[PDB]
Design a protein around this ligand. Sequence first.
Ligand code: ATP
Ligand code: MG
Ligand code: MN
Length: 517
Amino acid sequence: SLSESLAKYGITGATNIVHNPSHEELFAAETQASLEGFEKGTVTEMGAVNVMTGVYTGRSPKDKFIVKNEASKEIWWTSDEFKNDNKPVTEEAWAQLKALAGKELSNKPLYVVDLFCGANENTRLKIRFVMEVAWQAHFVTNMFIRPTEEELKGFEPDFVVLNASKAKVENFKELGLNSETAVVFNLAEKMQIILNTWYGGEMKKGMFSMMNFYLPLQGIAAMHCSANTDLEGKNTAIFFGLSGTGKTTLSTDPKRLLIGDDEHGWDDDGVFNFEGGCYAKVINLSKENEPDIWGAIKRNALLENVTVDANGKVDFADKSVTENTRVSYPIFHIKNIVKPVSKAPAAKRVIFLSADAFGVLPPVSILSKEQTKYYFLSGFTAKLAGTERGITEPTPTFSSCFGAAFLTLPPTKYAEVLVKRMEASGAKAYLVNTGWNGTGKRISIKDTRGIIDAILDGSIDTANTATIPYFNFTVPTELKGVDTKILDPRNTYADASEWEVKAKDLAERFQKNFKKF
Ligand SMILES: Nc1ncnc2c1ncn2[C@@H]1O[C@H](COP(=O)(O)OP(=O)(O)OP(=O)(O)O)[C@@H](O)[C@H]1O
Ligand SMILES: [Mg+2]
Ligand SMILES: [Mn+2]
């Protein structure tokens, strides 16, 4: 049965098959002393197992490709006019890549995990993961929605994901690839192959990209955002933001119930999470500053690339190798969460998080209808903390919809459905700088949380306002529980002219960039 299914994926001769392993079975497997290299798992003092993934400490967008065929006719392909990560490959290259992954996973012990991507049955995807490494199976078990034993019976996948990280593409040049690493998608065969990259995120972001294709085509918005509700479970709020800009951090609120922190859909019913866990950043983590994440880090959680010594002591501050240290864990490792299903009513507040490394954007701007669409499409922010391989220092960028690297349809399609939903729920939008200002340092988290509070409780709705030049941003002149001085981007500069010259330049950059739409 299962072996016959694997055969169709090109995998044969399996010596043992573990189907949806439990957490305890995963722990024992991960802690076996004979595990070599990137497969080795170390038990930390936190009680959770930690693994290292070498140089693959972030996504590999340059190695992401989509097979060009009838099934991917609607893919938002890359072009000189509008460059993106959707690079095309041929069926001929695919057969060879697939065969490569198949051979790698053949004749050996394998893990097969059947999961759900999407909290709603009417739009979810059934994913079957196949891998030879125990912690990899643990990673998907934490990040995806876990089906009951009944639902596993007769489980028929909609998408197959073959993780063949141990294999590499040496002849990538002749196959039209970019390097020995490869993350390819075939919508005809509905399969994802992972070759030569051990980064955990490749296992969740691939299907996220697929959900970003099917959902919008059904009028359902697919969003790179975190989302929570009040303690009553109403007044849903969503936080859009590029990798490492604040979604997880700011959605973490004691006065809120967490829906999800990274991937969400917005249908007729409301906002729902695609995942069953959180893949949080842990750099500089401390029990005092991040109680929840810290408490979530225990057995069954999986630390990734954190510094651990002999005694199993962890140094969450070491970023020498990477500042994109992570940890995945079932969402139920967090106390304040929406249940029994990660879904809630339509959002009332939509927040666009932007890490402006230019120090031009004010801490918070109250956006108009036109501005809401405009800044959502522009997605101005910055690639940071090694979320993508190669990016070390803050790099200004225009990532459409604050998640361009995961967009499989034109950004306008995402904006279209988002506005549609916002209009129906009467949601208001805001642009929040989680980046830098005149001080050359990032805006204080204390003030940012204070701004988030004013947005969620309506305080900002009646706050005194002023207009910021060039962008014509409407900003509050003051807010309770917020440092007044920072509200105006100009106040942290010795000479206002410094900000002006930068604001003027940034403004036209927007103008030129928006032309590609
Ligand atoms: N004002 C601020 N607001 C939010 N985060 C801030 C701020 N200043 C600094 N930070 C830091 O920026 C980082 C944001 O990380 P977070 O995990 O929230 O990113 P994310 O949007 O969830 O990324 P991903 O989608 O990659 O998971 C944290 O390390 C946080 O401490
Ligand atoms: Mg996050
Ligand atoms: Mn993300």
